[PDB]
Amino acid sequence: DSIIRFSVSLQQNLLDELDNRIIKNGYSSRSELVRDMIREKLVEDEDNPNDESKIAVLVVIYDGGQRELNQRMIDIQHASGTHVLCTTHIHMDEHNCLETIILQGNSFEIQRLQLEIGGLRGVKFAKLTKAS
Amino acid sequence: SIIRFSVSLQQNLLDELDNRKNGYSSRSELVRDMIREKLVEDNWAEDNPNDESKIAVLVVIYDGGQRELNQRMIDIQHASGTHVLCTTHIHMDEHNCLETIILQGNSFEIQRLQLEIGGLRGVKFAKLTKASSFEYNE
């Protein structure tokens, strides 16, 4: 119950923004800001994963010039156990594409899909919105 | 690239984090996703009123069978000043349909659209997915 240290790993872009935020908001260290972030997050809008079918949307921004990236996302979707209702792509700038994936599946399948796609090289982010 | 740094905290706080009760692979992943969300929120919070750069996706679930709800939503969007880049619509059942609205505009115009849409009768669900340039210019 003293002071523990643990390691966190960020992509440069995220780290640089964190560093910028530390300065702008008057924090003294990365450790201090991240610590404050964790206190807040714990107490705001705790859902046990279950077998209930739910409808969900995955918003993905990725590098459209990254070869095989879409194939890999398709591979992950195919094996995810989720039922993809449809996907929509648009070009948001000369490099980036924004894709919305509307799908249904249980908690385990959907969370698994978001994490696997989000961890792909070329994927800027994969943000999940679920309903029920 | 991926940079690793250490976060110092108390065991008591770490223990609450470690629980995830939720389905999360790891601490480092949960903390990272926490950091992303907060940083994006902070970014949107200081947005220039003259900025129309922001990208976002509005996920809406509503009663597709409720007459005039559609036009009501369109009227609101038309008066928002935001720009709709693309809308996708799928039918769930008689009284439910889902819509993903890809938006571009000022952070506060976009948030306003969400709040207005969400307060309409027949709208069951309206959630914003926010994006910041530091996420994808990088």
Position B58, amino acid? L
Superfamily of domain B11-43: Met repressor-like (1.10.1220.10)
d(CA B57, CA B55): 7
d(CA A45, CA A63): 31
Q: Does A22 touch chain B (CB under 8 A)?
A: no
C-alpha angle with apex A30: A1 to B26, nearest 5 degrees? 60
| Residues in A 58-117 with any Cβ partner in B closer than 8 A | 59, 61, 85-86, 88, 90, 92-93, 96, 98, 100, 102, 107-108, 111, 115
Contacts 24+ apart (CB under 8 A), B41-47: B41/B130, B42/A21, B42/A25, B43/A17, B43/B132, B43/B134, B44/B107, B44/B111, B44/B130, B44/B132, B45/B107, B46/A24, B47/B106, B47/B107, B47/B108
Question: Strands, DSSP E only, in chain B?
Answer: 2-10, 54-62, 83-93, 96-105, 123-131
Position B75, amino acid? D
b/e burial code for range A23-61 (CB count within 10 A of at least 16 → b): eeeebeebbebbbebbeebeeeeeeebeeeebbbbbbbb
Measure Cα distances from A115 to A96, A118, B19, B29 in Å. Answer: 20, 5, 18, 9
d(CA B19, CA B13): 10
Burial classification of residue A4, based on how many CB atoms lie within 10 Å of its CB (0-12 exposed, 13-18 middle, 19 or more buried): middle
Pairing of strands A96-105, A54-63: antiparallel
Superfamily of domain A47-132: ACT-like. Chain A, domain 2 (3.30.70.1150)
Superfamily of domain A10-46: Met repressor-like (1.10.1220.10)
Q: What resolution in angstrom units was achieved for this structure? A: 2.1
- Could you tell me which of A125, A124, A130 has the C-alpha nearest to residue A110? A130
CB B95 within 8 Å of CB B53: no
Q: Is A39 close to B13, i.e. CB distance below 8 A?
A: yes
CB B135 within 8 Å of CB B36: yes
Task: State yes or no: B97 annotated in a binding site.
Answer: yes
Approach to solving? X-ray
Taking the domains of chain A in order of start, what are their residue ranges? 10-46, 47-132
At the top level of CATH, the class of B44-138 is alpha beta
